[PDB]
Structures are given as structure tokens and as C-alpha cells.
Design a protein around this ligand. Structure first.
Ligand SMILES: Nc1ncnc2c1ncn2[C@@H]1O[C@H](COP(=O)(O)O)[C@@H](O)[C@H]1O
Lengths: 165, 264
């Protein structure tokens, strides 16, 4: 009897699934998840932090220029990833708004603060699939991660801490 | 996406070799058509995925070798720009651009191009390649990077000054082991030279670096106490200019932390 937990955090949706593999039969035993949690979500937490930071340093709100907000977000996605190896990253966005060249930094720590809540809400689905599978965390023999956004250190740590190691 | 088809469309445009010694309205035309395809590629490449797919399509190869080295400044900086956009904070695309030996073409351009814009987009590309990118920082140091850099700060080109200060601050954060080779290179004096310029945003980065060079590093603290520089009188006159200002907060934190560890 083997319980495998599949934790899939992608760019738009978060899906968890408890799958048992016994007697050579793979069977999905429970499913949960949140459809409003994904990498896209984390990105925007950084986008907001900077749009606000940009109001402070340049006395201007870039919110209504969507072409600019998009660049900001694409840039942020790049930083969020760098922040999975490095403990901090920097952003250089030439002429981001009204010809202003934008320069900033963010620490892995800061990234996490801005995403605190989002991070902790990934367990909800895990716990639910555990009830719906009439299982206890202590039984999950394996934990496999699938989905680009399962590399975020803080994600694997919250997950790992849950199963106490 | 229609993006892949569209950039493959730009690529098509960029691949067609230069006209057979065509005429005026055939050169200035053929060019605008590339300036355009290169800009469009930049906008598309701002997104990791697109830039990724750009590399798969041998795009990065045509860029580094052929265009960076174009004849028209216009084609050059736009190419640097694109090279930068794709790489920024993405290890895999950095590694590939690094592997095609761009840093050497970039650094060359930075250090001696007739168009200040090319030099600026080059520095931009360089930064996008060595920041938080270990293999790139080494190919950089080995290429006398800190010297191509400092010479830029010394250039009478603002954007070069800000861009240089910005990158040094970054580099100093993740690699304090270089503090020494930097001080002995006289970067403290140089950084201080940029402080005495008309205050503007980038100063946060100058003082930002300066602040790292001094952090647990007496050689650096010694560099700042140097009488000639008059760094103290300077930082107190600044510490006072950045007061009720929120748009300069980080400079004031830096400007103060400096005073606090070099004058007490
Ligand atoms: N190393 C990484 N660290 C954090 N997020 C990442 C990483 N690699 C990819 N992602 C994110 O994962 C999402 C794409 O997931 P996928 O569709 O499963 O490839 C995007 O929001 C990416 O930015």
C-alpha cells in the first residue's frame, strides 16, 4: 500500500492529488485545490509592491498604462525565478513609463513577506485531499512536486514542515 | 502563440542578408525594416517564454555574432537591447548568450563605440548577463570587467554613470569578496566623484555601493577617511538634503550608515 502526494503548482492553478500505488495498480484516491492560486498570483504581488514603490520614487502611478504594467510583470516573473537560487535579484526596465528608466531590487525574504498568505493557502488543498482520502499526513509515503512554481524555497519548506520532515 | 509566428517573422526579416550594394532609399529602408523587427522582438522577448523560444530558433546566434557587430549604430544598440531583454534574470538564456562569447563583444562596444546609445545598451546587456549570474561574473572579471566599468563611470554619459553605479551596487551585495580588489583600484575615489555631481536618483546606488565597500572592511573605511576626498563634509551636507523626502529614503539610509561607521 503506497500513498503518493502530487503537488502541482503551475502558472495559473494549484492542484494537489493523493495517488495510491499498490498491487501494480495506480489509483487517484483524492483531489483538491484552489483555482485562484498560481505563479501568476505571486508575480502580481511583486508587481504591486513596485508599482507602489514607483509612486514613491517618481511621483507617478503606472497602473493605467497596461503596456507598462505588463513589462513590469514580465520582469517580475524573471526576478521571482532568480529568487529561487539567489537570495535576492534586481530589475532594470528601460523607459518603463513616460521615458523613465526603472531600477530596483528585492530580497528573497522580502518576496516571501509580500506573498506570506498566498504561500500558506497551498496547504488548504493538501489537508482537504487528506480528509477526502480518509488519510493522515503521516501516511503519505512520497511527495513529488510538479509545476515550475514548486521551486520557490519557501514553498517546499512550508510543505516539508507540514509533513514534519 | 501568434507570438512565435510573429517573431519567426521578424527572424525571417533579420536573416535576409544585406542588399546587393543597393541605393539610398534601399538601404535606409532595408534598415528601418530591421530596426523595426528588432524592436518588436524586444517587446515580445520581455516575456521569459518568448525569449526562450527565440533562443530555440537560433535567434541568439544571429544576434551576438552578426548584428551586435553590424555597421549601423541603430542595429547595434537595438541588438544589445534585445540581448539584454532576453537574458535578464534567466540563467539558461544567460548561459547560452554567455557561451556565444557576447560579453567580449559587449565589453568591447561599451569601452569604445562612437554612439553613446550603443555604449549604454551594451552596459545594459552586460548587466543583464552578470547579475546574479555566477558563470557570467567570472567571464567578466577575467575580461577586466571592473576596469571597463569604472572607465564608463568616468565617461561624460549620464546613463553610463547610473547604469554602472547600479550594477556595482548589485555585484557588491552578492560578492563582498571583491571589496579589496575594488578599493585598491580606486573605486572609492570614483564613486565619491559621482556623489559630487548634481543629485539625482542614481545616487542611491552610488552611496549604495560605497556603503558596501566600507562594511566590515577597514581598507575601505580608510579610503573614505582620506582627507582629500572630503567625504565627511559631503555626506553630512547630503544627509541634510534628503530629509522630508520619501523618494530618497534608501539613499538616506545609506548616506547615514556611511557617516555612522566612518566618522565617530
Ligand atoms: N525556478 C522557478 N521558481 C519559481 N517559479 C518558477 C520557476 N520556474 C518556473 N516558475 C513559474 O512557474 C510557472 C509556470 O509553470 P509550468 O506551466 O508548470 O511550467 C510560471 O509562473 C513560472 O514563472
Amino acid at each position: 500500500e503506497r500513498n503518493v502526494l502530487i503537488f502541482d503548482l503551475g502558472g495559473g492553478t494549484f492542484d494537489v492529488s493523493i495517488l495510491t500505488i499498490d498491487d501494480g495498480i495506480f489509483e487517484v484516491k483524492a483531489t483538491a485545490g484552489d483555482t485562484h492560486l498560481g505563479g501568476e498570483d505571486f508575480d502580481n504581488r511583486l508587481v504591486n509592491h513596485f508599482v507602489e514603490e514607483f509612486k514613491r520614487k517618481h511621483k507617478k502611478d503606472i497602473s493605467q498604462n497596461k503596456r507598462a504594467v505588463r513589462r513590469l510583470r514580465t520582469a517580475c516573473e524573471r526576478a521571482k525565478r532568480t529568487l529561487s537560487s539567489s537570495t535576492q535579484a534586481s530589475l532594470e526596465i528601460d523607459s518603463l513609463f513616460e521615458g523613465i528608466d526603472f531600477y530596483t531590487s528585492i530580497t528573497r525574504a522580502r518576496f516571501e513577506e509580500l506573498c506570506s498568505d498566498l504561500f500558506r493557502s497551498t496547504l488548504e488543498p493538501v489537508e482537504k485531499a487528506l480528509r477526502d482520502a480518509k488519510l493522515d499526513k503521516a501516511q503519505i509515503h512520497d511527495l513529488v512536486l510538479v509545476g515550475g512554481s514548486t521551486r520557490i524555497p519557501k514553498v517546499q519548506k512550508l510543505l516539508q514542515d507540514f509533513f514534519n520532515g | 502563440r501568434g507570438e512565435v509566428e510573429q517573431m519567426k517573422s521578424c527572424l525571417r526579416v533579420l536573416s535576409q542578408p544585406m542588399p546587393p550594394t543597393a541605393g539610398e532609399a534601399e538601404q535606409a529602408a532595408d534598415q528601418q525594416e530591421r530596426e523595426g523587427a528588432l524592436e518588436l522582438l524586444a517587446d515580445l522577448c520581455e516575456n521569459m517564454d518568448n525569449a526562450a523560444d527565440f533562443c530555440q530558433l537560433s535567434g541568439m546566434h544571429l544576434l551576438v555574432g552578426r548584428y551586435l557587430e553590424a555597421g549601423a549604430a541603430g542595429l547595434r544598440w537595438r541588438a544589445a537591447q534585445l540581448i539584454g531583454t532576453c537574458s535578464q534574470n534567466v540563467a539558461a538564456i544567460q548561459e547560452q548568450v554567455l557561451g556565444l562569447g557576447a560579453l567580449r563583444k559587449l565589453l568591447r562596444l561599451l569601452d569604445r563605440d562612437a554612439c553613446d546609445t550603443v555604449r549604454v545598451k551594451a552596459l545594459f546587456a552586460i548587466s543583464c548577463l552578470v547579475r546574479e549570474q555566477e558563470a557570467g561574473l567570472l567571464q567578466f572579471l577575467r575580461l577586466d570587467g571592473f576596469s571597463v566599468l569604472m572607465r564608463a563611470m568616468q565617461q561624460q554619459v549620464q546613463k553610463l554613470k547610473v547604469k554602472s553605479a547600479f550594477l556595482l551596487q548589485n555585484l557588491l551585495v552578492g560578492h563582498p569578496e571583491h571589496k579589496g580588489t575594488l578599493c585598491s583600484m580606486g573605486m572609492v575615489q570614483q564613486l565619491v566623484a559621482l556623489v559630487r555631481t548634481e543629485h539625482s536618483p542614481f545616487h542611491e546606488h552610488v552611496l549604495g555601493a560605497l556603503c558596501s565597500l566600507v562594511t566590515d572592511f577597514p581598507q575601505g573605511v580608510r579610503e573614505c577617511r582620506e582627507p582629500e576626498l572630503g567625504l565627511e563634509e559631503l555626506l553630512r551636507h547630503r544627509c541634510q538634503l534628503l530629509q522630508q523626502h520619501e523618494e530618497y529614503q534608501e539613499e538616506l539610509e545609506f548616506c547615514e550608515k556611511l557617516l555612522q561607521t566612518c566618522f565617530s
